[PDB]
Amino acid sequence: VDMYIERAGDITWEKDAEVTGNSPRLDVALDESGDFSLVE
Amino acid sequence: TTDGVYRVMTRGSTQVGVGVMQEGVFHTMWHVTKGAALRSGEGRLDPYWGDVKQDLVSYCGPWKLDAAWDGLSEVQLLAVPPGERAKNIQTLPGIFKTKDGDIGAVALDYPAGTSGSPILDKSGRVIGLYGNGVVIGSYVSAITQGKR
Numbered sequence A: 001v002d003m004y005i006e007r008a009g010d011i012t013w014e015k016d017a018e019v020t021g022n023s024p025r026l027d028v029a030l031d032e033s034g035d036f037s038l039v040e
Numbered sequence B: 001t002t003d004g005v006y007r008v009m010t011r012g013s014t015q016v017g018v019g020v021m022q023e024g025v026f027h028t029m030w031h032v033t034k035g036a037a038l039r040s041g042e043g044r045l046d047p048y049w050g051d052v053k054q055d056l057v058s059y060c061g062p063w064k065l066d067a068a069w070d071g072l073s074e075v076q077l078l079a080v081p082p083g084e085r086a087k088n089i090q091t092l093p094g095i096f097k098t099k100d101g102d103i104g105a106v107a108l109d110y111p112a113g114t115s116g117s118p119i120l121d122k123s124g125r126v127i128g129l130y131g132n133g134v135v136i137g138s139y140v141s142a143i144t145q146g147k148r
Helices: none
Strands: A003-009 A025-030 A036-038 B004-010 B014-022 B025-028 B038-040 B043-045 B047-051 B056-059 B075-079 B087-091 B094-098 B101-106 B118-120 B126-129 B133-135 B139-142
Touching (some): B014 B126, B094 B139
Parallel strands (some): A025 B094
Antiparallel strands (some): A025 A036, B014 B025, B075 B087
8 A cells, every 4th residue: 555745835824814613621531542532 | 855734645546644744754643644654756754753642653753843832822724635725724722621731622623634734833833733633523633742
């Protein structure tokens, strides 16, 4: 299986960016497999 | 080798993720490549460091990205979705609260092949990578940053 990379852009902040999304505060645990789960 | 954001492709061809070239090191998420070597032109990039718990891997050298969210300011996801031009999405992160401290998180839901896309602070520095997270039915990604 050939995995390969292609350049897609510069790493730059864009002044004209779409703004969206919430800012939830969540309790989580991170297990040994790198999986986040919610906690209560 | 050139600095930038990159698609990670497999073989028809499919985009399985994204990563960041900086200071001669390619940075992406473990779940994207599982550490496999990557072709870049006629060259090969070999893994150098990886960690399943952090869900991160670096190629050609140690992890170089060390900026962190300031906890107050909006950030931008430099999303590189499959089949789409790199685009910036600005957002105020929420927070993953964990026993070992708080982590920024972005409540943005892009296709799986966007995993590894960089999240940027206002100065243009990569503060982490997108694509390891939790579901609340909306996905929320940690801002995953390694250690330099």
